């Protein structure tokens, strides 16, 4: 209703987390697992969390399910301070299992739900564009005319096009679309060539390359080579699940980012909060705060 | 931590332990590839886990079945608690701190089953005894699912006289855990799938267990009946089902223990129960993991004429 700081369209859903000893998995008919926790997640639901973690403002609008997971999140939000935007859809709320072993490697098991061509009444994210500093647009299929409308609306604007092969035309109208753009290094072929893509074809203004334990790159149209933000390690805190690490990464920086215009200093920024997210079990279950990122940004 | 539920009437089987949920992923193939992320169909969240396996497929068969586990305040917990309200079945139970039973099943295209089984109850936690003891004296027969608890229900229940029986599932044969049902049942029903020396094992609970006879359950190569009298295991053919080809063979045990018991319960022939099983855990394989289906009566009498 009223206005924030960092609007997120789209993703948020329902994680199962089960640990296993190692991937790929055994040849078994049956293995036996310790304790498998069911958590409110998704990257859209971890940006809005980690945005909100930080003493902003954040707001979601995504499509939910009226499943018993749908309701999960609706006062999961309303348990924290965050406002919540949604439609219902009778194919139910996106959800996913999610293996992960207990060094860090992560398998995700993706449910998107939704029919494809769906498209949700505009007025959903577009209420919140109104009363929005930033967007950042989770690369749900229809949240695209989202980012359409945000740009069109002159607001900053991101996206987390995640593991995406830099080929395929899915996440294109995101990486093109967007001013501050983020995406996992894991599947990219030709990183330089894609980010110069990027550059060339979108109005990407800088692109951020989140590469799990090896830290960060960020790439801008001034350099040719890619700024090496190097991985934080927390005095007291150990990796223990790497999920929902790019999401509080990203929630870090925009935070920064809308302060200080400082680029580097955000990517520092996401850093933290990035290596704070592994401290903790179970996809966005733990963000920095203010008082906890200024004491280790001084580290 | 004082037994709770719905209870009244007289039951047939009583099911002591054994439910919880699965959440059920359809996945390409097994095993699995090596990716960062890929998307499956539809996640379904059902109530399952072997105890509940029996007592439906009881219920499924006209007889009266109930219901003694430990389930969680969790909203599995509920889950299941208003799943039994919608079938007429009793739940007895008492609540735990750490939750409800679930377990994450990987299925195929093909059939292909891995499940990732999470007991999530502290190995040493015994509820009190009023559990099942109200159980026991409404049933003729209680059926022991392997909670380490549930130890002393099948003592308890042997001790009221009932006809008792259990599910090992895989079992080397050399486990102590096992043991303890294994040598106190009635009826004993063990998957062929771990068994080292088969013969050497059953030779082993006849002597040491009161073990009537023991069945043992060998998927798609069918299912074997062990006495005390014939030294050789009477071989019961896996059945085809007419109209019904096979497609996921998850469910198949405690749906062959269900019909076993319902129709033991009734005529005390052993072969003829040990067909009817046969059919019933068949039904299950004709079933995909998703879908709650068991045998009815009609249906099963009609394919053991045949
Ligand atoms: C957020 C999500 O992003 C990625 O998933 C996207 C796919 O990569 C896209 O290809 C597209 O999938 C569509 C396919 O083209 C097609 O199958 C069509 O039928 O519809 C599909 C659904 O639209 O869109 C997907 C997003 O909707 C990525 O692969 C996936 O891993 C990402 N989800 C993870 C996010 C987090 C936290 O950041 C975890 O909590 C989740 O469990 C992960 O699943
Ligand atoms: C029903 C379940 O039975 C079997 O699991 C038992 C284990 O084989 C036992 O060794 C014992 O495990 C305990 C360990 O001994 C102990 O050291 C500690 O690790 O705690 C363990 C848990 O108490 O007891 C287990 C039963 O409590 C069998 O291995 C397992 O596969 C069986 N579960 C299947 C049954 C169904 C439906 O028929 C499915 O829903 C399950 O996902 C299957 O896994
Ligand atoms: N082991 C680690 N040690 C320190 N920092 C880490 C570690 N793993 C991840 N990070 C930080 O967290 C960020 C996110 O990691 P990464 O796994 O690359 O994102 P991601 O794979 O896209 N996660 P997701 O958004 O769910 O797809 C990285 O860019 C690092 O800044
Ligand atoms: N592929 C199959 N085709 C036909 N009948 C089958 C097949 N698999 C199993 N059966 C029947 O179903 C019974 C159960 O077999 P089995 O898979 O060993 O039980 P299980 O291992 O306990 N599976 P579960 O129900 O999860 O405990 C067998 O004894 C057969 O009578
Ligand atoms: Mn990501
Ligand atoms: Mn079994």
């Known amino acids: 209703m009223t206005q924030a700081d960092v609007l997120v369209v789209g993703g948020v859903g329902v994680d199962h987390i089960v640990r296993v000893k190692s991937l790929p998995l055994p040849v078994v008919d049956s293995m036996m697992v310790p304790p498998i926790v069911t958590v409110v997640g998704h990257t859209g639901n971890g940006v809005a969390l980690g945005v909100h973690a930080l003493g902003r403002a954040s707001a979601m609008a995504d499509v939910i399910g009226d499943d018993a997971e749908g309701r999960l999140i609706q006062d999961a939000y309303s348990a924290a301070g965050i406002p919540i935007t949604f439609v219902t859809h009778i194919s139910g709320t996106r959800r996913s299992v999610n293996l992960v072993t207990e060094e860090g490697q992560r398998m995700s098991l993706y449910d998107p739900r939704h029919p494809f061509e769906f498209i949700p009444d505009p007025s959903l994210w577009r209420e919140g564009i109104e009363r929005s500093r930033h967007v950042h647009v989770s690369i749900m299929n229809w949240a695209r005319y989202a980012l359409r409308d945000a740009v069109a609306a002159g607001r900053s604007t991101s996206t987390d096009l995640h593991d995406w092969d830099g080929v395929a035309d899915y996440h294109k109208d995101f990486a093109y679309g967007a001013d501050y753009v983020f995406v996992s290094a894991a599947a990219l072929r030709d990183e330089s060539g894609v980010v110069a893509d990027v550059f060339a074809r979108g109005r990407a203004q800088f692109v951020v390359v989140m590469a799990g334990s090896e830290g960060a790159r960020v790439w801008r149209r001034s350099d040719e080579l ?39 200093g955000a990517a520092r920024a996401g850093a933290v909060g990035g290596a704070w997210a592994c401290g903790t079990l179970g996809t966005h279950t733990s963000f920095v705060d203010v008082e906890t990122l200024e004491r280790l940004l001084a580290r």
């Open 226 to 264: 890619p700024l090496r933000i190097s991985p934080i390690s927390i005095p007291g805190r150990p990796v223990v699940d790497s999920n929902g690490a790019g999401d509080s990464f990203v929630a870090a920086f925009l935070c920064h980012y809308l302060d200080h215009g400082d680029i580097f």
